[PDB]
Symmetry: D2
Subunit: 115 residues, 4 copies
């Protein structure tokens, strides 16, 4: 599992469940092509987005749909989404965990990269 996403809710102190996540990869013409998508589980984790074969070098964008998450909880948040944009696999295959910690007017994102 080369790309995993974890989302936590800083208001409730819980995993953020059922958060939609869309991954894009920059194409040769510099547009964002759709790459993979999914939603977080009851643990706040999203596994199975991609495979070692599919997850080639490139510039990837992970768009976490934080607005829909907050709206479903009856909350009007500030951001449209949380975006993480990074170059992947430039020195060979790595495993990436993108973590996001959500508040209505704030978010933090961190990456854990392992070989």
């Amino acid at each position: 599992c080369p790309l995993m996403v974890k989302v936590l809710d800083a208001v409730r102190g819980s995993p953020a469940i059922n958060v939609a996540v869309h991954v894009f990869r920059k194409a040769a013409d510099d547009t964002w092509e759709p790459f993979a998508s999914g939603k977080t589980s009851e643990s706040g984790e999203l596994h199975g987005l991609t495979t070692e074969e599919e997850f080639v070098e490139g510039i990837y964008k992970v768009e976490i749909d934080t607005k829909s998450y907050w709206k479903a909880l009856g909350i009007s948040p500030f951001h449209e989404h949380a975006e993480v944009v990074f170059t992947a696999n430039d020195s060979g295959p790595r495993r990436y965990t993108i973590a996001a910690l959500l508040s209505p007017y704030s978010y933090s994102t961190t990456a854990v990269v392992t070989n």
Copy 2:
């Protein structure tokens, strides 16, 4: 000053100086068109981006060039940039401050919206 940006460096414990910031407004065809830009000052702040007359309701993207900032310090970064996307909504007088706290493999962003 309806829109201000502040950037902090969590490695050195200092304002993030000379960071390029580009602001875009979402156009009717869903593209991002340039709206305002600048570089943070010695205090890590970027003032004078826009005026009340031109800062209308809409979806805005603030792109902070974190990768170039880290490279100028000789520090290896993860992200290509930090992207903060939000809707500006007229509800009485409102000033927007977008703050970003930068680390090489993590960033936090928050919005301070005051009257």
Copy 3:
């Protein structure tokens, strides 16, 4: 102003106003003795805590009463308070800003140390 404290609210996207802050200095017997205190202003800032003459090298603790802040807003918090513990070191002119970004089940703190 050698020591300033700033507190932000990540749920409401606002300065955290009227937050009690107590500063302690570590004494020779390893106990924490009161040094300075106050409440954040309408801008979320607490100025005038100490003077350059009295703010000597040492270990300091900044206790932010986050629990009372959240209770006054009717929001259920996790932490009893936020504690920021650091050594002040004389190395040329130095001003210390301790910033805290508050959510009910999370907080971030950073130090901005300038000349």
Copy 4:
């Protein structure tokens, strides 16, 4: 496992390994009595601090030795440690995960509380 601690390094994008963690519980005389301690593994996780029987109601303090972590990496950090202070189990037993994200001049902490 009712109390677990996870620590990540925001400079390297990795688990923070071999971080010492000391847990205290407030005694009847209002002093901090030692409760449990350990160090993070290669995954940045610390398991086995306590048991369901031992982890009674009370006010607990989790002190994460961030200064030693940074010093071992040849880095001079700002904070002495990262402290998390919270009331536990007041509405019955819960499971607590305390996560900490570390930078030399900044840290974030979050709690995930499950039933």
